[PDB]
Structure 1
């Protein structure tokens, strides 16, 4: 069964057959669409099927389906599972696994890049200090002095779920948030809770508006430990505007490397709970969301004041006006410092080309429109006009609850 998606700006129609290979569920029913809902120990029993299916994918892609190396590997995994209950991925399968999880990430507009992922195998890691080292190396490699390179570092898979490796930070680099006694917030409001945990684990907080948080790392189910990323390793870009000279005086800066550290990577039924990955920013992530969300740094008002906009009625579009300036500033600052960044026009257009190619060669590209469309200027980017079909493929990245919610403290 074939499904069609139309682009209402070009009348280009596409046929999806790939959704057919989709087993996980969406949260939707024929009676309800949950398309805008943000979040809608295994058995030997369930594991070999998931293994088989993954290895069948892998082997097809290398054009070896049904080969002897294919049959043998299935038989090998099959035995390893019954004997040991889990199984180990070959390097080749891990790489392929990790690239595919990205390729399948329906909410990611950056996917045209999926096949270029640098995979770092950290499955021999045993301790938090071991993790700090792997993470430091990932940061330096990926940062590459501003010429950012995508990368993922993969720690040991879950075994009994009592020995999980976890990166407690949501991103490797993020700024502290400090709730004050007067209810206000200093720093990033999104990171207040995590910040507190760090302080409580004995982090001495400098308490500024842009303090880079320490890494809190859990190896093998043990209590997490704190570490400071070498500062010479954290590339930051001070934010200025190409015409507004007072802009720099806002004191804004941002880190250059976005690196998601709280997701679970599932491959062939295995669960890698620590698998930080990084790319480079699309400008609106910082300029729209990070700076302008009301519950983030919320600088729209102050930027608006400085521009002397009529802030007395929303119908002056002062908010919109300040938002464009701030986003101009972000892109300007990055390009000027030669740190990789991509604007939302260029990014969304790339995604369209990527998506069409994916339909052409793969029969589909699962995409979540609520997430692919940028948080400003939606309809003047080509994805807005693009119908999309959202469904779950594996390998995949998934959310997991915050570890402080689940962790058994050893004390």
Structure 2
């Protein structure tokens, strides 16, 4: 009922009680752990609204005040009548900040209380959505000095009028299959890149073509829009000692902006809620550049480095990986675009966990995601026991819209 987690490097032991407030299910049972699986009504709504509004008023030191109870009646009356309800601005901001605070897979949560919330609930069309998104992109990018933000479009109603951003991130590169059988660009986006084409996009057919936004408003068919190029900050990748590195022709964008998730607050569902922060270097250098199913560049780099690629035991992949990652951090830093290294980020998250334990009685965390994809054990999170559980408000995955939309 009261659980302890230990850091095996420092012996620090924390007691978790926050998990008892957990509500949603994990996918595990007493017989089987699924910790490494990637994807494990009016009557229903008031209980969810009540639970939310109680935590909200408790947070503002007004638990069981008249203003607390009045709002509970108000929302009750509103549900019983309209079969849904609308969040006050204060509640919406609180709900969004807490969805982030509760995101067990996010290592950057020390930042959670500094989130700029853009309320786009007045939006009615895809052009309106495009305008909101451009403003989000420019605000957050801030000439390289990145600031966290989320833009929140109207909540789901009958599910036949959903707002959706079809892109997985606001800014990503296209992927094309060639006769060669190979992939040009980002293989992760081949399908979407095709859906854009099938929709009219004129692909440049290059290695780093910024996809267009495919925006869906009020359940209508989605429309294409090109983000003003001048709003998309990109970084050419060079190495501080290998002059040949620049010749690899690599670049990445400065703004990570996840756009395909669903925000749930007080039982209300916001299916279009793009949010952004800034990168941890490994995301680009380890995963985007080196995953076999991504730009998969280890072989080329290794060759430029003249390493013995004869045998795995020379660790040539590991050598190349380090250099690639030095280059990413160096390039973002030189151009003054915000980026965090994995050492710095994980040390932050350990401090965040400790704040959260003493202030909230816990911090849900998914060790499988939090531990960086390179140099795991030389980062402090590797040695930290974590407990994973689901709190609400939350960000949730949702099915790709094209598998679900009826044209």
Judge same fold: TM > 0.5, yes or no.
yes
- Which position in structure 2 is the counterpart of 1:402? 400
Q: CA-to-partner distance for each residue in 1:148-167, whole Å, 9 max, x for gaps?
A: 00000000000000000000
Runs of 4+ in 1 over 3 A off after TM superposition: none
Partner-residue secondary structure (3-state), 2:112: helix
- Aligned to 2:289, the other structure's residue is in SS state helix
What residue number does 1:23 align with?
A: 23
- Consecutive unaligned residues of structure 1, counting only runs of 5 or more, are none
Partner deviation per Cα, 1:250-282 (whole Å, 9 max, x = no partner): 000000000000000000000000000000000
The offset of 1:224, in angstroms, is 0.2
Q: CA deviation at 1:182?
A: 2.1
1:75-106 C-alpha deviation (Å, 9 max, x unpaired): 00001001100100000000000000000000
What displacement does 1:68 show? 1.1
Alignment match, 1:104: 102
Alpha-carbon distance between aligned partners in 1 of 2:356 and 2:299, rounded to the nearest angstrom: 42
Question: CA shift at 1:347, angstroms?
Answer: 0.1
Count of residue pairs the alignment pairs up: 407
Q: How far is 1:360 from its partner?
A: 0.6
Q: Give how far 1:366 is off.
A: 0.1
Q: 5+ unaligned residues in a row in structure 2: which ranges?
A: none
Q: What does the per-residue CA deviation read over 1:124-152, in whole Å, with 9 as the maximum and x for residues that have no partner? A: 00000000000000000000000000000
Q: Secondary structure at the match of 2:214?
A: strand
Question: What are the Cα deviations for residues 264-321 of structure 1, in whole angstroms up to 9, with x where unaligned?
Answer: 0000000000000000000000000000000000000000000001001010000000
TM-fit CA distance, 1:38: 0.2
Q: Deviations over 1:160-198 (max 9, x none)?
A: 000000000000000000011221011000000000000
1:388 is paired with a residue of what secondary structure?
Answer: coil
60-69 or 338-347: bigger deviation: 60-69
Aligned residue for 2:14, secondary structure, equals strand
2:149 to 124, 148, 151: 151
For residue 116 of structure 1, give the secondary structure of its aligned residue in structure 2: coil
* Offset from partner CA, 1:198-219 (integer Å, 9 cap, x none): 0011000001000000000000
Indicate the SS of the match to 1:329: helix
State the alpha-carbon separation in 1 of the partners of residues 66 and 137 from structure 2: 40
**Shift of residue 373, structure 1, vs aligned partner:** 0.1
- Which of these residues, 367, 370, 376, is aligned with residue 368 of structure 2? 370
Aligned to 1:206: 204
Within 2, Cα distance between the matches of 1:142 and 1:183? 38
The answer to whether 1:381 aligns with 2:379 is: yes
User: SS where residue 113 of structure 2 aligns?
Assistant: helix
CA distance in 2, matches of 1:301, 1:64: 60
Task: Name the CA distance, whole Å, in 1 between partners of 2:253 and 2:31.
Answer: 43
Distance 1:67 1:231 in 2: 51
Candidates 294, 297, 300, aligned match of 2:298:
300
Secondary structure in 2 aligned to 1:296? coil
Deviations 1:324-350 (A, max 9, x none): 000000000000000000000000000
Provide, for residues 329-385 of structure 1, a one-character-per-residue CA deviation record: whole Å limited to 9, x for no partner: 000000000000000000000000000110010000000000000000000000000
RMSD: 0.4
Distance 1:232 1:64 in 2: 46
1:377-411: CA deviation from partner (whole Å, max 9, x where unpaired): 000000000000000000000000000000011xx
Of 108-117 and 180-189, deviating more is 180-189
> How far apart in 2 are the matches of 1:183 and 1:122?
43
Distance 2:55 2:198 in 1: 45
How far has the Cα of 1:63 moved from its partner? 0.5
1-side partners of 2:179 and 2:264: how far apart?
42
1:2 is matched with which residue?
2
Q: Secondary structure of the residue that 2:4 maps to in structure 1?
A: strand
